[PDB]
Amino acid sequence: LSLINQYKSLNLSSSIKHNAPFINRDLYVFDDLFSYNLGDITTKKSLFND
Amino acid sequence: LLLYILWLEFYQFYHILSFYGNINWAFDYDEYIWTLELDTRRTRLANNYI
Amino acid sequence: NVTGKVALATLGALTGYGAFYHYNQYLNLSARWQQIQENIAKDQPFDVDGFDAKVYPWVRENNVNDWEYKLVKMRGYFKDQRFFVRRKRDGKEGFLVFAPFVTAVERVNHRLKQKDLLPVEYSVFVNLGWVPVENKKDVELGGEVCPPMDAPTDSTLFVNDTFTGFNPDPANPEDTEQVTLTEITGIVRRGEQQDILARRRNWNKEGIYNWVDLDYMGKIFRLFNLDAINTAYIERVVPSFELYPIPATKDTFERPLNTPERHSTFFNFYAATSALSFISMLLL
Amino acid sequence: NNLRLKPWFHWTDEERSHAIFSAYEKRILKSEDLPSFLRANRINNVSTWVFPLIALPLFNQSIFKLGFAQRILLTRPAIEWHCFKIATVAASWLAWLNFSPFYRKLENEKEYLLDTLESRIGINVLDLNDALPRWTTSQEYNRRTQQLYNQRNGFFAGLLYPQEESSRPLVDIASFPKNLHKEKLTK
Amino acid sequence: MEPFGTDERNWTHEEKDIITRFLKYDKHVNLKTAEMVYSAEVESAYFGKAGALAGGVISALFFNFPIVRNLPIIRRSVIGVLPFLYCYTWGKNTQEELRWLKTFAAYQRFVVYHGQHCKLWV
Amino acid sequence: ANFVIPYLKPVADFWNSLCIDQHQDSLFQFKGQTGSLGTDWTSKYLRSEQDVYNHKYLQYHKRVHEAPELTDVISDNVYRLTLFAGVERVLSVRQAQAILKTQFAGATENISGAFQTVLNGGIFRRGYFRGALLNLLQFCGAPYQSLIWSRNSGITNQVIVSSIFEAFFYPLDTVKTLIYNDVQGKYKGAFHCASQVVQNAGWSRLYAGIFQKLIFNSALIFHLNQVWDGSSQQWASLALVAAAYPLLVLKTRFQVAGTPLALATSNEVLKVNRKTLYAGLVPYLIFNTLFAYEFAAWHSSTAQERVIGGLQNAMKQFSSPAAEQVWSS
């Protein structure tokens, strides 16, 4: 009875992408904009900030 | 009318005699179960005399 | 004479209406069953992950008819207790086996060192399969329904999930937060109701169960989300091949009580009764 | 061994019949163990309410034509003759009830069922006994067992009466919560 | 906390309901006080239904009483429903009284717990 | 304990089931935990006190969306069928009273007269509860099947389906009306009355006022739909039902006309005094306003919104009135 209209949206990702103050993440320039020597990356590595 | 007075007096008398056994519910957070605990009572002596 | 004619006419009218109703229900049920079979043969399970694994889509929107017989996939750990409901599969007596399935865990203790609080577990009932009456003693307590899910290859996935609260870490430094996740696929089905004339009646005190009473099953197992348990349950469906319980497949999942065969039998009975009543009325 | 006292060595016939009935009702005894005992039970009933009939003409041919009986018939009022006949038939009926071959067979069948129970649940067979109602009889408990057999092993099983196959949940009784606490009341 | 005296206003229905829902759900309330209010709610609910049902049965019997059964329909109906009204009122009043007495005991326990009564200290 | 309690105890159990909250009591029966928090007595009590309105919502949801069940509809309209089933007979007698000879046997031409005519026979099969089983059968037949075949339908489709089913089941209505109005108890049952009517007047005499019943049922369905929505047109619908009530009166008079139960033959039904056209208007309106038909299947979007909004508003009480507005929560 309490769940009838309590949860309108479930995707945080869409709201983040359409409202966060960051440049669009689908740009094609992010592929070869800068050059780095990353060695060998055989595992999914994630970058952390600050 | 005497039957009515008898019921009223018995009700009060039963309450008074029911005072002297302190029966309470105690929660056991470790077992998540309530238990019925029996104890004595302390009160002003004038109450006992009356 | 005249009373007999009146009784025959009334009986014929009632039985003809019953036959017509059962025929229309048979047509509707056959069409819906064809749609259900096509949808199941499509074989695109809906992944119940994240928030959907805490409060389920058929509970949140309260649309189990839109989610009935519907392929879903969810991961969690089964609880030890098993529930048996008397049922016949392929014309032989047996038991449907139900197990609790914890799809989300919530921890609400902030005095972690002082207090070891029990977690709030969100669970749904999963029909593991069907076991014959001979082999009911072969169902083991806390058995392995499905092999445990493989560990993810992303090092950032080894933390407690935001919504489900599960840590997919085989070697978790937090011993009290160590969970083993098994991933099942099944079909969402609704719960059953009592029908004494259908011989689906359960004596809870004696332990005899004939229909799926999700309310009682949730209460007896001391589960938490009783409403989200009563709404529906997931019947486990193995991909192609089906030791005890024997899981359902794409072609042998447990049939509902209302079937086109049942309605056809009722239609035949009522049509025969109406025809006999009219013949007797004509004779009289 | 005939020197080992069985757990039911002191039970009465009503207690034995109630133990069998409770074992069958609690699904400890299957319907495959009853058909012999039940049969004997029925014979015992026929052995009780037919004997005076069988004993009525036989005495008229054997005992009531003797010298003492004829003396009573000829030298005493007809009411005393009726009293003598009824007393003799009732004494014979009581002796038959105490010492009947079919009663012995019924007791043997009940003993076999109790032995099966002890082989199944061990010393916990003593847990099948209770404080029975005063006026409920061994025959009444046997009739209740027969009624339960008819209900389970017949039509309407699963419609009006619980089935013989149990569907109790599979739990660990060592850890599963219980209704009664050891000493206190719980809510 | 409440004003005391003859001239003071008695607890109104809204005040009683607000205090009950305060004691049931609010923090700053020990588990014992909330349990007292919960036990008040559980046990009191029997009496309203019991009074209504007993009144219904007694009124069904009274509608056919030796003198009532021979009255005109208006008088017969009024006299027949009188027992139902009396017993329904008894049930409702008993439920309210039991629930509110236990709730007020819980309120006194809360007030003493937080020292919110002058001339009361350990 | 051996001879009386085995019979007295079930009555007390039934009394408690009618009195004690069954869902809450059953919830309290399973005391303990099996690895989850919130299965203690306090949490169970809290969810049970929140489960009353949730259970009401679930029952309404089952009535609206799922296929209707006879037991649910009967329990939804239990007072019309069980306790006040004799008021239907009283209203029928009042409608047919103008030609029913009841004025010549200890009764007047008013609602008290109809009540006394019904209640003179007794409180049972010959009296207040005469035709009650026939009334229950008629309710199971026409309105329940109409609900089954038009579950979520507009008012026009409701009227169409209801008219079809009332036409199909009308002879039962005629038999019930004739059984309502035999003060001397000439008919021993429904089959006997139908047989007498067919033998003495033919099969076509069981459809005396079918068209009047259909038109009045259309008006009543419109009024019920306006009542369920809670619209301001409830008074306009009441006026429409008051205007259409003479159709119901004429239906009853045509049904009882040719039989020996009445003074007037069918051709004389339209010759009755015009002032008697609204025979039982006020009692009928009062009875329907108090115990109207509750067909939750036929509830429109507005009615569903009203009921569910009422439940949701009733669910707002489960919070502390003195709750601090905290910066971090």
Put simply, the answer to whether E53 touches F18 (Cβ < 8 Å) is yes
Number of residue pairs across C and D with CB atoms under 8 Å?
52
Q: Which tokens belong to F116?
A: 């006394």
Q: How far apart are CA C80 and CA F257, in angstroms?
A: 73
Q: What are phi and psi of D138, to 5 degrees?
A: -60, -40
Q: Which tokens belong to F69?
A: 């069940």
Say whether C208 sits in a helix, a strand or coil.
strand
Q: What are phi and psi of F326, to 5 degrees?
A: -100, 145
Distance from CA of D97 to the nearest CA of C (A): 37
| Cβ density class F268-286: b for 16+ within 10 Å, e for less | ebeebeeeeeebbbebbee
Contacting residues of F for D187, CB less than 8 Å apart: 28, 31, 41
Q: How far apart are CA F252 and CA F212, in angstroms?
A: 9
Choose among C99, C46, C42, C109: nearest CA to C76.
C99
Q: Which tokens belong to C43?
A: 């074989």
* Alpha-helical segments (H) within chain C: 2-42, 57-60, 214-220, 226-230, 260-283
CA B11 to centroid of chain Cα atoms: 12
Q: Which tokens belong to B3?
A: 């039957």
Put simply, the answer to whether D186 touches B35 (Cβ < 8 Å) is yes
What is the number of other CB atoms lying within 10 angstroms of the CB of residue D11? 18
Are D169 and C83 in contact by the 8 Å Cβ rule? The answer is yes
Resolution in A: 3.0
What is the number of other CB atoms lying within 10 angstroms of the CB of residue F128? 21
Interface membership of D181 toward C (CB under 8 Å): no
CA C13 to centroid of chain Cα atoms: 38
Half-sphere exposure of F292 (CA within 13 A, CB side): 17
Nearest CA in chain B to E31: B27
Interface membership of B39 toward D (CB under 8 Å): no
Q: What are the C-alpha distances in Å from E117 to residues D99, E16, F42?
A: 85, 19, 28
Interface membership of F30 toward D (CB under 8 Å): yes
Q: What are the C-alpha distances in Å from C147 to residues C48, C75, C141?
A: 18, 11, 16
The β-bridge partners of C77 are C102
Choose among F255, F253, F167: nearest CA to F217.
F167
The β-bridge partners of C203 are C208
F/B touch flag: 3 or more CB pairs below 8 Å: yes
Choose among F253, F117, F116: nearest CA to F182.
F117
Contacting residues of A for F57, CB less than 8 Å apart: 1
Q: How far apart are CA F227 and CA F249, in angstroms?
A: 23
CA F204 to centroid of chain Cα atoms: 28
Q: How far apart are CA F47 and CA C224, in angstroms?
A: 10
DSSP-assigned letter for residue C93? E
DSSP-assigned letter for residue C255? P
Q: What are the C-alpha distances in Å from E45 to residues E32, F17, F24, F28?
A: 20, 12, 11, 15
Terminal alpha carbon distance of chain B: 25
Question: Residue C44 class from Cβ within 10 Å (0-12 exposed, 13-18 middle, 19+ buried)?
Answer: exposed
Identify the chains in contact with B, defined as 3+ C-beta pairs within 8 A.
D, E, F
Put simply, the answer to whether C108 touches F37 (Cβ < 8 Å) is yes
Which residues make Cβ contacts (< 8 Å) with residue F115, sequence separation at least 6?
E73, F90
Q: What are the C-alpha distances in Å from D23 to residues D110, D112, D173?
A: 12, 13, 21
Q: How far apart are CA F82 and CA F75, in angstroms?
A: 10
Are F30 and C219 in contact by the 8 Å Cβ rule? The answer is yes
> Side chain identity at F248, as an amino acid letter?
L
Nearest CA in chain F to A3: F312
Number of residue pairs across A and C with CB atoms under 8 Å?
20
Distance from CA of C122 to the nearest CA of F (A): 9
Say whether E101 sits in a helix, a strand or coil.
helix
Q: How far apart are CA F99 and CA C270, in angstroms?
A: 42
Contacting residues of A for F312, CB less than 8 Å apart: 1-2, 4
Strands (E), A1-50: none
The β-bridge partners of C126 are C99, C234
D158, D159, D170 member nearest C141 (Cβ): D170
Identify the chains in contact with F, defined as 3+ C-beta pairs within 8 A.
A, B, C, D, E
Are E63 and E80 in contact by the 8 Å Cβ rule? The answer is yes
Contacting residues of F for C219, CB less than 8 Å apart: 26-27, 29-30
Answer whether the bond into residue E3 is a cis peptide, omega within 30°. Answer: no
> Side chain identity at D171, as an amino acid letter?
V
**Mutate which of A1, A2, A3 to test chain C, going by most C C-beta atoms within 10 A?**
A3
Q: Which tokens belong to F226?
A: 């306006």
Which residue, chain included where needed, has tokens 């299965």?
F39
Say whether C29 sits in a helix, a strand or coil.
helix
Strand pairing report for C46-48 and B33-39: unpaired
Q: How far apart are CA C209 and CA C230, in angstroms?
A: 16
Say whether C233 sits in a helix, a strand or coil.
strand
Say whether C103 sits in a helix, a strand or coil.
strand
Terminal alpha carbon distance of chain F: 58
Q: How far apart are CA D98 and CA D114, in angstroms?
A: 22
Q: How far apart are CA C211 and CA C191, in angstroms?
A: 9
Q: What are the C-alpha distances in Å from D49 to residues D43, D75, D88, D94, D146?
A: 10, 32, 16, 12, 18
Find residues 23-52 of chain F whose CB sits inside 8 Å of chain B: 31-33, 37, 39-42
Q: Which long-range contacts (CB under 8 A, 24 or more apart) does D97-105 make?
A: D97/D48, D100/D44, D100/D47, D100/D48, D101/D47, D102/D40, D102/D43, D102/D44, D102/D47, D103/D44, D103/D47, D105/D40, D105/D43, D105/D44
Q: What are the C-alpha distances in Å from C158 to residues C146, C148, C151, C174, F324?
A: 21, 16, 9, 12, 38
Q: What are the C-alpha distances in Å from D126 to residues D24, D115, D140, F197?
A: 15, 12, 21, 71
Strands (E), C60-177: 70-78, 83-89, 92-106, 120-132
Q: What are the C-alpha distances in Å from C2 to residues A25, B17, C6, C71, F203?
A: 87, 77, 6, 59, 11
Q: What are phi and psi of F164, to 5 degrees?
A: -60, -45
Strands (E), chain F: none
Q: Which tokens belong to A11?
A: 């995707």
Choose among F128, F140, F39, F49: nearest CA to F91.
F128
